[PDB]
Amino acid sequence: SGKIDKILIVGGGTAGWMAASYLGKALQGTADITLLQAPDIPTLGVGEATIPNLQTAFFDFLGIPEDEWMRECNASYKVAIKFINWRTAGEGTSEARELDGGPDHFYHSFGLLKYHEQIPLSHYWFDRSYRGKTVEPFDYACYKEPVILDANRSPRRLDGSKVTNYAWHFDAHLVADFLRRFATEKLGVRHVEDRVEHVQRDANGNIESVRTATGRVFDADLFVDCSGFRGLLINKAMEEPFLDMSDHLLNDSAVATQVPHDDDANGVEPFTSAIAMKSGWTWKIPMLGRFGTGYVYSSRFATEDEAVREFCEMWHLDPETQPLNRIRFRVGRNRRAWVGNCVSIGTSSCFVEPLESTGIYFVYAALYQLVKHFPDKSLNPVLTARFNREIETMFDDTRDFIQAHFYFSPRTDTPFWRANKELRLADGMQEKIDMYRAGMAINAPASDDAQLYYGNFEEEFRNFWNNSSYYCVLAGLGLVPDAPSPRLAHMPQATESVDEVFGAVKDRQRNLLETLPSLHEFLRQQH
Amino acid sequence: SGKIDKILIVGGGTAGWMAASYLGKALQGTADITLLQAPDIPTLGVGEATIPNLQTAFFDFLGIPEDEWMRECNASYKVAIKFINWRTAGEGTSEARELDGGPDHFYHSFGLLKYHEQIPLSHYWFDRSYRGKTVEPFDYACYKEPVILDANRSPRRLDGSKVTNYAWHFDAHLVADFLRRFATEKLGVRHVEDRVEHVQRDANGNIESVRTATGRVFDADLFVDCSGFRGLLINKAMEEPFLDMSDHLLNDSAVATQVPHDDDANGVEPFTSAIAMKSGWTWKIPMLGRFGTGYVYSSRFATEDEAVREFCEMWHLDPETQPLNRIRFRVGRNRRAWVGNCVSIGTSSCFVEPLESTGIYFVYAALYQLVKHFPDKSLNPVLTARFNREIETMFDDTRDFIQAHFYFSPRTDTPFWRANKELRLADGMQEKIDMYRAGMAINAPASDDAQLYYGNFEEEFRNFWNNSSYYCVLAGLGLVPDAPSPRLAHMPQATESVDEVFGAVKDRQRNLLETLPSLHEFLRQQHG
Ligand SMILES: Cc1cc2nc3c(=O)[nH]c(=O)nc-3n(C[C@H](O)[C@H](O)[C@H](O)COP(=O)(O)OP(=O)(O)OC[C@H]3O[C@@H](n4cnc5c(N)ncnc54)[C@H](O)[C@@H]3O)c2cc1C
Ligand SMILES: Cc1cc2nc3c(=O)[nH]c(=O)nc-3n(C[C@H](O)[C@H](O)[C@H](O)COP(=O)(O)OP(=O)(O)OC[C@H]3O[C@@H](n4cnc5c(N)ncnc54)[C@H](O)[C@@H]3O)c2cc1C
Ligand SMILES: NCCc1c[nH]c2ccccc12
Ligand SMILES: NCCc1c[nH]c2ccccc12
């Protein structure tokens, strides 16, 4: 048994061609990579949102500069997720209700909270807010972004210079085809259109070959399952159980479409919107000339017909003739992502609703971990176990985080919102909440330098949902600590000199609002 | 209801005065601190090795620059620990035995392995070593330090500039009095010389007051137990069990002394030496004009005078007129470090043999965690439990790492060394060892910039035993992965451009050996 010579990727979606590119690049010249792709019924481009380390962990690894892949994938910019109507009762409407003398929205941005005297700014904010010396919401106090996104500002100046961390909106299909052109033309990855009919296992349970409907036989040392929800290798052949996590997350379906948009009349929003509905929530993902939107809902509280009506009524579309994608979801993960010589990547591995833009991240996180734990033909079980462990906490921490959005929403107005609250949080989530209520940071980053964070994948992986995110969502929803951090009573000079830090955020808010172009103005100049 | 107003620290050894300093500085003007310390028979200054974040996480916190406290405490410099005779049978001697045409030593330095193409240098070194492309030991292949340490070089040039990460050797008593001066004269900590006679608990089991032999009563909101191994508050007053962990560590005793040394004829060694013995190991901690040494041994494999003799023979000392400290200690940690309103700090909290220079680190790492989890008079149970969780991971991870020095030693030549190979590793440690054999890094540091690591306590705390330390020790002892990392066979260009990384080390280790003063020469420049 020596090094891995041949790899077969089954599936050609976004997960499949990311796997081909990432492995083709990481193993360039030392493995023969073949990807089998069957023709499928095409779907509408309903948009995908990403996170900053898509450029630094994935496209940079491939050697592809941001502007080369954005121009082909007709991409727009994402500075935040804006959460609309999660605290107020009513119908599913794109317009924000009023709450406390302002619109009912909050932002989850990408910046990291600045440390002041070893303590995150979130704790100083809560200190003032608790003692009644401020009523400003958490996000507006601590981040510059909310003010400039309220104004649809660009994250780059017209000279290109970057003023905030950002990620991307795009149609996943265009990226998949950009990558297929890249893997096949630049990395030697070989594309074969064919449909798997039968998987041959040996007496050790490993995959020996796949036989296509053509009668061609593909053998390989390592098999990457990118077949999506079907899991034609990890689940069908290897029989690995799927853990259903509907005791943590009730959402299991979506209806989505794509809406033309006049960017010169209305501008382009530099964020993804997550709009609370009666039985779930709706995404809006701006792109060029159009936006993708989808209603993620719980089949147990809304029939598909009601969801379609709620979804169409909200965008004033025809429930009968609007081209819709109707989807039923597998929510959860495999008991183990990698079994024998079969690695699952993408939705064949795990799926959670895209409330925090993790779909694509789960793909290239797993491949980074796959290469880090790359085997040889002896398939040392410790590599397989280590990988599985990383994939397991990556998903479960996200499941936990996403659940908190529903658990801590104060809404009680529909059976869906009342039911979410009846679920139990996972033990590791409950323990984080206890910490948060006691005034401590949750997974505070070691440094507050965002380049170190978003530029170093292991630093960000080891601390993916950090204190800034927890505050954004938890404080946003209105769950706040029972009392300030007790150290702050012993730090009379820190709590006074901290005002100059909040005032710095305000100076940035005011100055960036006056000098930045709108996102649309910036997009036009690019092209 | 309300903030902590009054703290009482019981114990004024090294742990107490750091606790006074650190807490006195972190709560300045917002809490009254009293330290209560009894007249005890003092010990010989047997010396203490430290680690670089002593400056960045403790003295820098106090605002005390490195030059001020070094000159006052007669401190010398530590670049590494040198492990001697861990791989060869024989008696306890200070001279390295011979092994594969070289001396039987290896070093554990403070650097971090450079990354090359996201993979640590250790993986490329083992690649070559396993394919026969090299026979050079890991520590000499990957670190500049070993060559310059072999020549007792200084980590600083005579103009001051720092060419290596380093820490300190000093006599703990001197650092304690320096901190007692600092806390009492500049932080307002009130020092009371008296003996604890009675601890008064309230109905919920918390501590209400301690009464002294002179009849004085001191009350407080928070009690910090620095009474050493006695544990007068945490163990005796609060009844918190001590968890003995000699099923992982056999060493429970020591015999230690201070030996005078001719620095003008032999220079000053810039490293702690850990010298393997028949029934344990011996530290040597060089200072100015002298060095601390101590034989750490297992009372179940050597009687107390078997040890005194082995130890006096190796240093050519007279067993009958040499002043000797003899201690039997408890090994392990409290079930909970903090209970009620009582926080243990120092050996009242936990203890492991000083094979890796952790004892003082445990004091200020815990003080750091204490301030970060600082309570108010309602003593939120979540603050206590997170604190206790951080303390026990700190300790258990060190307990494991230390056990591995004895477990993977190849020696089989005394009951002691053969007895180490029949203990179990803790499952977590066993798991890291499996990863190591599989070619993987172990707790690889997020970055390879050592400033970001030794300068950011949170960074180092979350990653305290990083992959560099595991390779220094396991590869040093001769435990090496079953095969090279499977990724290296897929990275033709990486394994060829790595030759320039090993060459950069070879150049830097050749160039410093010619340009660096001896440590001695540097030491004389600072003191007058
Ligand atoms: C409806 C939907 C909406 C989503 N929306 C978002 C979003 O808004 N934001 C976000 O971040 N993420 C979103 N995601 C997650 C998204 O799918 C990620 O892009 C994910 O990484 C894609 O993984 P995948 O390609 O495995 O999924 P799939 O698209 O399910 O992969 C299916 C592929 O499997 C291949 N295949 C299957 N069977 C065979 C066979 N027998 N032979 C050969 N080939 C076969 C086909 O080629 C097909 O292209 C969404 C996912 C879905 C399904
Ligand atoms: C043998 C040995 C070797 C070591 N080597 C190293 C090394 O190489 N590197 C390293 O980094 N660290 C080392 N250490 C670290 C060691 O753990 C630190 O020195 C430790 O933090 C100091 O011990 P302590 O102050 O907790 O206990 P002690 O010094 O025992 O504290 C005793 C104090 O407790 C007080 N006290 C006790 N009982 C009472 C009472 N009833 N009433 C009032 N006061 C009381 C007294 O004031 C006394 O002063 C070593 C320790 C030992 C023991
Ligand atoms: N460390 C990245 C966490 C993150 C995931 N999705 C997000 C959306 C907005 C802001 C941060 C995130
Ligand atoms: N993170 C520092 C770990 C360490 C403890 N003791 C040491 C001695 C030498 C080198 C590193 C260490």
XYZ file of C-alpha atoms and ligand atoms in Angstrom, chain B residues 51 78 80-81 108-110 356-358 453-454 460 463-466 469, ligand 4:
30
model
C 8.967 30.587 30.267
C 17.052 30.438 29.764
C 15.874 25.875 26.391
C 15.785 22.782 28.585
C 13.395 21.756 23.965
C 13.664 25.380 22.754
C 11.201 28.261 22.868
C 9.008 21.754 32.035
C 9.163 24.953 34.077
C 5.457 25.314 34.804
C 2.273 33.642 20.422
C 4.435 34.588 23.424
C -0.522 30.792 24.088
C -2.336 26.349 22.439
C 0.088 25.832 25.284
C 1.728 22.530 24.267
C 2.117 23.137 20.547
C 7.141 21.084 21.917
N 4.061 27.362 25.484
C 5.277 27.165 26.253
C 5.382 25.688 26.673
C 6.708 25.364 27.399
C 6.612 25.128 28.757
N 7.856 24.850 29.259
C 8.758 24.917 28.209
C 10.163 24.730 28.170
C 10.824 24.856 26.953
C 10.114 25.182 25.795
C 8.734 25.368 25.839
C 8.045 25.230 27.063
